């Protein structure tokens, strides 16, 4: 059957000390009855107030990005800094960083591999653009992305790896992927992992969907076979995120 579902919150570059406090207080008041790993990925700045205020036992804290090593990299944050700060989860290879901030398939693969070695739980992001999908290159783009990541990983590493399939055309556009569209892609990814790494890993691997997930469409999306949770953007800054957590059965 399905492995433990994951309800990850990608706040991206948003939030004030007051606004995020209210969300955290709400998350702390929420009664979650089923086995699901809730994840809050705030900015580096808000990591401190989140570490202190978030007390719900099913919630963990993540960073939204990092680099491999500490050193002469002004503006950046490294994995050892995050590990020293008590952060054990991290989102890597998001479409916004692939597009805006020059993170190729290999650069993402190196970051994921370096995070796994450091002991991080990694939410690795893959997905095609509207341009790539219409040109019939969804499969060759997504599989190439995860293949690059897989190339720098050992079989034992995948226990600390979570794939977040996020079609760029669904990223905060309102154009949520059809339950079949999400299922068909997740099935393809899981099929690839089963053939190249192992059927056991593919069974344990958790493939999340990201792309305009909200309280209305979450339940029917998770009802699909190869959907193991969500990476939520816009709706994670709202009380609506609770419904998405509940939508993980």
Residues in contact with its own copies by CB under 8 A are 10, 12-18, 43-49, 63-65, 67, 70-78, 81-82, 84-85, 91, 94, 96-97, 100-102, 171-172, 233
| For its own copies, the closer CB: 99 or 159 | 99
| For its own copies, the closer CB: 103 or 128 | 103
Q: Is 155 annotated as a binding residue?
A: no
SS3 readout for 181-213: HHHHHHHHHHHHHHHHCCHHHHHHCEEEECCCC
First vs last C-alpha separation in the chain: 13
- Closest CB 68 distance from its own copies, rounded Å: 10
Q: Which of 47, 91, 31, 49 is nearest to 245 (CA)?
A: 31
Catalytic residue among 94, 103, 128, 186: 94
Q: Note if 134 is an active site residue.
A: no
| For its own copies, the closer CB: 72 or 156 | 72
| For its own copies, the closer CB: 84 or 134 | 84
| For its own copies, the closer CB: 71 or 136 | 71
Tokens of 206: 């958790």
Catalytic residue among 46, 132, 166, 186: 166
- List Cα–Cα distances, 231 to 106, 109, 197, 204, in angstroms: 22, 19, 24, 18
- Closest CB 211 distance from its own copies, rounded Å: 12
Tokens of 117: 């070695």
Q: Note if 166 is an active site residue.
A: yes
- Closest CB 179 distance from its own copies, rounded Å: 24
Name 199's Cβ contacts closer than 8 Å, sequence gap at least 6.
none
- Closest CB 119 distance from its own copies, rounded Å: 16
Which class for 100: exposed (0-12), middle (13-18), buried (19 or more C-beta within 10 A)?
exposed
CB environment 25-57: b (16+ within 10 A), e (fewer): eebeebebeeebbbbbbbbbebbeebeebbebe
CB environment 205-224: b (16+ within 10 A), e (fewer): bbbbbbbbbbbebbeebbeb
Q: Is 10 annotated as a binding residue?
A: yes
- Closest CB 12 distance from its own copies, rounded Å: 5
- Specify the pairing of strand 37-41 against strand 59-63: parallel
Annotated binding site for substrate: 10, 12
Q: Which residues are marked as active site?
A: 94, 166
Annotated binding site: 10, 12
């Amino acid at each position: 059957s399905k492995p433990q579902p994951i309800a990850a919150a990608n706040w991206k570059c948003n939030g004030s000390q007051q606004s995020l406090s209210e969300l955290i207080d709400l998350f702390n008041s929420t009664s979650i009855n089923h086995d699901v790993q809730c994840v809050v990925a705030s900015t580096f700045v808000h990591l401190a107030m989140t570490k202190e205020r978030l007390s719900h036992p099913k919630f963990v804290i993540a960073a939204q990005n990092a680099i491999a090593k500490s050193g002469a990299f002004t503006g950046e944050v490294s994995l050892p800094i995050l590990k020293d700060f008590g952060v054990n989860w991290i989102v890597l290879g998001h479409s916004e960083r692939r597009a805006y901030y020059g993170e190729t398939n290999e650069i993402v693969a190196d970051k994921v591999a370096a995070a796994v070695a450091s002991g991080f739980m990694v939410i690795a992001c893959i997905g095609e653009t509207l341009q790539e999908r219409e040109s019939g290159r969804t499969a060759v783009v997504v599989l190439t992305q995860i293949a690059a990541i897989a190339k720098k990983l050992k079989k034992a590493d995948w226990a600390k790896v979570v794939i977040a399939y996020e079609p760029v055309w669904a990223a905060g556009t309102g154009k949520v992927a059809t339950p079949q569209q999400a299922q068909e892609a997740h099935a393809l990814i899981r099929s690839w992992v089963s053939s190249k790494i192992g059927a056991d890993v593919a069974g344990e691997l958790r493939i999340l969907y990201g792309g305009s997930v909200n309280g209305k469409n979450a339940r029917t999306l998770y009802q699909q076979r190869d959907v193991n949770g969500f990476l939520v953007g816009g709706a994670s800054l709202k009380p609506e995120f609770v419904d998405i957590i509940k939508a993980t059965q």
